[PDB]
Design a protein around this ligand. Structure first.
Ligand SMILES: O=P(O)(O)OC[C@H]1O[C@H](O)[C@H](O)[C@@H](O)[C@@H]1O
Ligand SMILES: O=P(O)(O)OC[C@H]1O[C@H](O)[C@H](O)[C@@H](O)[C@@H]1O
Ligand SMILES: [Mg+2]
Ligand SMILES: [Mg+2]
Ligand SMILES: [Mg+2]
Ligand SMILES: [Mg+2]
Lengths: 221, 220
């Protein structure tokens, strides 16, 4: 049986992938870059703050000083943080709270593997901090998803090897990071977007301890 | 949220489907019928006593007098009743007791929809009688499963509409009966036998209050 579950936050626990998209959209248009639409946002999901800006910059081949780069990243975050002030326990996606309770009840470790530095604020505002045995600190992990670093760190932070872990993700980059880490990905979204080679659920209500066990087992074979 | 759970008994609450199968198998061979194997028994699960006997006879194209037909049904039952004298709380399938507690804790009606006239005796030997708000009396409904009559009666006996009820069943006929009642079936057994069109769990430990809730919420 798997010994840990590594949670993405934005788009898995709550509807904050939407707000990241809005805020990034707003930053691009401000600096004159027009192609950050929903289809392009699929490449930004799971991607770290600085790396997300660089994708946006590359879209227009725009080049900026190191100082302006830092300033744009701060401006997007100041905006995003203003967007997420209403988040509360009411915004926790379906299945998630029960899943955390069941994981804690069955002594399965729970770790956050969110690239977001706003992760801890959101878990507290959603009154979920108590469920998390560990949070991987994006300030500590060298490389943004699709690099596995964050999922490796989360597994280790709860004393578990990635091969004994499930990762829950809504993004292409995060799913690749799970695979490359050795953990077992279970995606939430459209198969069109996240790939029909892995187990994809239409929404988080499908994420249940028993569903995770079925997946796991079927994997073992 | 669903307002009642209509329990089958044999093969759901306890392992008595096996006892019925043994008994029917031993009776068939006595009148010379050798083909009552596990695969054929899937056609007997959920079926009333007299109908199960008629199926066994039809398997061999055998005809008997009305007197012998009664006599054979009584013979099987006398043997079945002997077999079940040892049943106790130790024989309740896993998960079943906790489920009943959680349903009664959540004020969800619990009704028996067992075609077995031995149903109340088994509930008492398993010390489960207290949990049941009502028991549908199979003597009062003529039509055996797969007809929905028994499940209709069980739901009505606890004041709940079948469409607001979940039925738990181990048999092909009962799952058909639940379906035609309008209730939501969740089977326990092999999907090969009960159909991969409905939610099927491998054993009763999967029957938990929250699983019933997730399944029901997953409506349409
Ligand atoms: O800007 P931060 O709050 O540190 O978030 C950095 C990244 O983490 C999240 O998990 C999202 O999937 C990304 O859209 C976001 O850019
Ligand atoms: O003979 P009875 O105890 O009246 O049982 C009548 C029927 O009820 C049970 O639920 C079983 O599924 C059937 O195998 C049995 O034939
Ligand atoms: Mg995400
Ligand atoms: Mg300068
Ligand atoms: Mg049965
Ligand atoms: Mg009572």
């Amino acid at each position: 049986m798997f010994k840990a579950v590594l949670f993405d936050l934005d788009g898995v626990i709550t509807d904050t992938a939407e707000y990241h998209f809005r805020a990034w959209k707003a930053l691009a248009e401000e600096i004159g870059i027009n192609g950050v639409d929903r289809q392009f946002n699929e490449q930004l999901k799971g991607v770290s703050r600085e790396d997300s800006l660089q994708k946006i910059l590359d879209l227009a081949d725009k080049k900026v000083s190191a100082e302006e780069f830092k300033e744009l990243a701060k401006r997007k975050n100041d905006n995003y943080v203003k967007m997420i002030q209403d988040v509360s326990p009411a915004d926790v996606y379906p299945g998630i709270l029960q899943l955390l309770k069941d994981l804690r009840s069955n002594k399965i470790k729970i770790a956050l593997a969110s690239a977001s530095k706003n992760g801890p604020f959101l878990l507290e505002r959603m009154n979920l901090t108590g469920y998390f045995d560990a949070i991987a600190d994006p300030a500590e992990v060298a490389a943004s998803k699709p690099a596995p670093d964050i999922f490796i760190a989360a597994a280790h932070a709860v004393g578990v090897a990635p091969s004994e872990s499930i990762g829950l993700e809504d993004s292409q980059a995060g799913i690749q990071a799970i695979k490359d880490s050795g953990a077992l990905p279970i995606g939430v979204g459209r198969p069109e977007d996240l790939g029909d080679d892995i187990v994809i659920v239409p929404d988080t209500s499908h994420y249940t301890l028993e569903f995770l066990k079925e997946v796991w087992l079927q994997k073992q074979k």
